[PDB]
Amino acid sequence: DSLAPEDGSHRPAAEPTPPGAQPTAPGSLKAPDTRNEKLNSLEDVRKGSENYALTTNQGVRIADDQNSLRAGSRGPTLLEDFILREKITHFDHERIPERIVAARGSAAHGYFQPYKSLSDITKADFLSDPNKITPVFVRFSTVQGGAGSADTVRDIRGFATKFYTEEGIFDLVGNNTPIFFIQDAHKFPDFVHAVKPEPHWAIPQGQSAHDTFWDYVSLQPETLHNVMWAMSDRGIPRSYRTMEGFGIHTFRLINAEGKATFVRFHWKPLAGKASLVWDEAQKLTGRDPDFHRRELWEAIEAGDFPEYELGFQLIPEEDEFKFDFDLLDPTKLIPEELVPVQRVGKMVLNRNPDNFFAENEQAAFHPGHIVPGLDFTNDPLLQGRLFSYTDTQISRLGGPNFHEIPINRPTCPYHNFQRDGMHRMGIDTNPANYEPNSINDNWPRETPPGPKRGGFESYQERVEGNKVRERSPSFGEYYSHPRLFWLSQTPFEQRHIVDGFSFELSKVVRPYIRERVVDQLAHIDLTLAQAVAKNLGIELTDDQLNITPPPDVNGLKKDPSLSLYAIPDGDVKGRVVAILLNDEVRSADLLAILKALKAKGVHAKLLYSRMGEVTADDGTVLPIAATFAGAPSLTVDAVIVPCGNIADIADNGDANYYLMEAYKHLKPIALAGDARKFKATIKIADQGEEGIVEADSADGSFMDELLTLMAAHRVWSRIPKIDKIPA
């Protein structure tokens, strides 16, 4: 019965469309023409559906999938209904354990390619040739919340890339900030328990704003650097496309001659850096908890492919000890003012998965998954990570054969003597399951290390020391990097940092914890410490006021690359504007608005007080994307109000509040013709005001001012005006 509409409107066109234009869909149906080697290799397990009979898992066609088998139509269900039991059994067993950390994440397929050969510094096959493409799978995530938690929380973001190389899988498992909270992997469970929901009541979700987190931070000053990053606007990215990525640890690059080069991995977002503001972000976890997931999926459906530039910070082996911080300390960043990021390659994400569970939920990444040409270092955090991902994957994915789960399979060859385990897919025909063997003539065989296609051989680092459970004395400095980060932020980024600490500490119930954290802030910067202290009604002591600031990092008093906004990096493609309609829209304004939006690749969402349609003044029928309350200003980058019958929406509560929220969250607002009467709602300016575009009509000039503002992301100069606005 229940079938598709005759018009065929149930199914999304298989071409790039803007967000909201068509129902989203599985990647292979949205873009059948988008391929890569990994994408094709999943064809063995893709399952269609159209034109096939509904069956059991054993392939028996089902006649009636609406009812259980019973004795009489009002009778008891019979034990012999095998169809019902298989159906209910599969359903009952759908869930698998979520990841211990990063349970909440959104993923996509894509490809990578180096800009030039890196064979002088590394023998890594995937970095050897500019025209050799490496398929990737990337998962972006939060850290604390569960898989059903919200996206736009304040938290670190994970940025894990699986490279399916010709010489093995390489997982670059990083975050959106260049350092981690702790130094040694042994304290991982401690740190994660402290930030996770408190054990008695399992509160709070997706938030570090609770006593245990701040307790731990107050007693472990090594966390202060990543805490600064987390409290800044870096903790609430606008999108996964507009954040940086970092491997955090110093790893090693090994060339064909055996030379080791220390390296730190970087991802540069080609859509630029951009973050939300706290109020927006918090409210957005309620209005659309799947905001980042959605925005990623829709950007890929629209052709706005998330693009990132892989970059390398390279440090000669001889310079290991030349900085004032240890290179192997993951709570320390390497300032770009000291070691520049060399551009390495471009990664493009151009296809969503088909089934989230099968591909995203079951994906397994591992920082230990390196290939010849890469090696580890003694970073003590990194070191414990090598152990942990392997271990957790055995229960999360039910056994040792998780590399056989389609998304995780290498696309290159893999042969060894490992056998059995739960859900073994591969059926080995090798007479031998051990080596050395003579019965299969010793195949598969070991391969000597070499310049290309050689077996893995660890870089022979010299190890000298006693067996000790001891932190390096060189790791015992906790305040200079926090201070370097603080001084590198613009004045409005600094204010946001203060507000993040003030908000969070206000949620800490035990007041002494707040004081200890303030005391820690006093060792970083007195201005910062005093601003937070004032917000918490706390008075710094005389001693606290005489704490000497930490030294500069190798002479640096600031590093502009640590700021999200000091250096303009503004790209509007992929952004989205709310267009607040009325029932007699000036079609001339609209045509002009969409033409300029379209030239810059900026999307629009047409909003009204109801759904359905409204007819413009020239008889153009405009489908409504959502209502003013249905898609709040939180979900867009700027708001445009075209002329027309403004009286239709002039007294609309939601339409007015729409602008007040957008204004409070520093977003550009453009008002044409009679739409300018809305300036009274945002009680501000009479002539004009920077951030508010106004004109008699929406013209070329009007749109260029708007797009220029959008390229600056937010109207920071309006900050002083917002705290009187009641919104």
Contact between 405 and ligand HEM (CB under 6 A)?
no
Alpha-carbon distance 162 to 403, whole Å?
12
Dihedral sign from CA coordinates of 113, 115, 117, 118: negative
- Print the SS3 string covering 160-198: EEEEEECCEEEEEEEECCCCCCCCCHHHHHHHHHHHCCE
> Which lies closer to ligand HEM via its Cβ, residue 365 or residue 628?
365
Contact between 52 and a second copy (CB under 8 A)?
no
- The option from a second copy, ligand HEM, none interacting with 446 (CB < 5 to 8 A, set by class) reads none
Contact between 47 and a second copy (CB under 8 A)?
no
Alpha-carbon distance 581 to 640, whole Å?
9
**543-602 binders of a second copy (CB under 8 A):** none
How far, in Å, are 276, 403, 493, 681, 702 from residue 678 at the CA level? 24, 58, 29, 6, 17
Shortest CB 465 distance to a second copy, Å: 2
**334-363 binders of ligand HEM (CB under 6 A):** 363
Contact between 656 and a second copy (CB under 8 A)?
yes
Residue closest to ligand HEM, measured at CB: 158
Angle between helices 491-506 and 526-535 (to 10 degrees): 50
Which of 124, 169, 172, 173 forms a contact with ligand HEM (CB under 6 A)?
173
> Which lies closer to a second copy via its Cβ, residue 256 or residue 624?
624
**Residue 78-97 contact track with ligand HEM, rule CB under 6 A, x = bound:** ----------x---x-----
Contact between 122 and ligand HEM (CB under 6 A)?
no
* Cross-strand pairs, 613: 623
Residue span binding a second copy (CB under 8 A) among the ranges 22-30, 122-130, 332-340, 444-452: 22-30
Contact between 388 and ligand HEM (CB under 6 A)?
yes
Contact between 315 and ligand HEM (CB under 6 A)?
no
Q: Are 574 and 603 in contact (CB under 8 A)?
A: yes
Amino acid residing at 197: P
Contact between 497 and ligand HEM (CB under 6 A)?
no
Contact between 467 and a second copy (CB under 8 A)?
yes
Which of 45, 202, 599, 647 forms a contact with a second copy (CB under 8 A)?
202
Q: Given the structure tokens 């009286």, which residue do they identify?
A: 647
Which of 180, 229, 291, 608 forms a contact with ligand HEM (CB under 6 A)?
180
Alpha-carbon distance 649 to 73, whole Å?
56
Shortest CB 671 distance to a second copy, Å: 16
* Cross-strand pairs, 175: 158, 246
> Which lies closer to a second copy via its Cβ, residue 148 or residue 431?
148
Which of 101, 270, 675, 698 forms a contact with ligand HEM (CB under 6 A)?
101
Residue span binding a second copy (CB under 8 A) among the ranges 23-31, 335-343, 438-446, 704-712: 23-31
Which of 103, 397, 671, 715 forms a contact with a second copy (CB under 8 A)?
103
Amino acid residing at 282: Q
The count of residues interacting with ligand HEM (CB under 6 A) is 31
- The option from ligand HEM, a second copy, none interacting with 14 (CB < 5 to 8 A, set by class) reads none
Residue span binding a second copy (CB under 8 A) among the ranges 433-441, 509-517, 554-562, 710-718: 509-517
- Print the SS3 string covering 284-350: HHHHCCCHHHHHHHHHHHCCCCCEEEEEEEEEEHHHCCCCCCCCCCCCCCCCCCCCCEEEEEEEEEE
Contact between 175 and ligand HEM (CB under 6 A)?
yes
Contact between 627 and a second copy (CB under 8 A)?
yes
- The option from ligand HEM, a second copy, none interacting with 657 (CB < 5 to 8 A, set by class) reads a second copy
Shortest CB 175 distance to ligand HEM, Å: 4
Q: SS3 of 481, please?
A: helix
Alpha-carbon distance 163 to 172, whole Å?
8
Contact between 97 and a second copy (CB under 8 A)?
yes
**222-251 binders of ligand HEM (CB under 6 A):** 248-249
Which of 600, 681, 705, 712 forms a contact with a second copy (CB under 8 A)?
681
Contact between 146 and a second copy (CB under 8 A)?
yes
Mention every residue, 6+ apart, whose C-beta is less than 8 A from residue 202. none
Contact between 445 and a second copy (CB under 8 A)?
no
Torsion, CA 632, CA 637, CA 642, CA 647, rounded to 10: 30
Contact between 317 and a second copy (CB under 8 A)?
no
DSSP readout, 241-298? Answer: GGS-EE--S-EEEE-TT--EEEEEEEEEETT---B--HHHHHHHHHH-TTHHHHHHHH
Contact between 71 and a second copy (CB under 8 A)?
yes
Residue span binding a second copy (CB under 8 A) among the ranges 89-97, 159-167, 367-375, 637-645: 89-97
Contact between 385 and ligand HEM (CB under 6 A)?
yes
How far, in Å, are 114, 178, 215, 311, 315 from residue 336 at the CA level? 21, 11, 32, 11, 12
Q: What angle do CA 423, 425, 431 make, to 5 degrees?
A: 115
- The option from ligand HEM, a second copy, none interacting with 141 (CB < 5 to 8 A, set by class) reads ligand HEM
Q: Which two tokens stand for residue 434?
A: 């051990």
> Which lies closer to a second copy via its Cβ, residue 118 or residue 579?
579
Return phi, psi of residue 427, to 5°.
-105, 105
> Which lies closer to ligand HEM via its Cβ, residue 99 or residue 210?
99
Contact between 412 and a second copy (CB under 8 A)?
no
DSSP readout, 491-559? Answer: HHHHHHHHHHHHHHHHT-SSHHHHHHHHHHHHTT-HHHHHHHHHHTT----HHHHTPPPPPPBTTBS--
Q: SS3 of 621, please?
A: strand
**243-272 binders of a second copy (CB under 8 A):** none
CB atoms within 10 A of CB 231: 23
Q: Are 569 and 273 in contact (CB under 8 A)?
A: yes
Which of 174, 221, 335, 372 forms a contact with ligand HEM (CB under 6 A)?
174
Residue span binding a second copy (CB under 8 A) among the ranges 158-166, 173-181, 264-272, 350-358: 350-358
Q: Are 501 and 354 in contact (CB under 8 A)?
A: no
- Site of interaction with ligand HEM (CB under 6 A): 88, 92, 99-102, 105, 139, 141, 158, 160, 173-175, 180, 185, 188, 248-249, 330, 363-365, 381, 384-385, 388-389, 392-393, 396
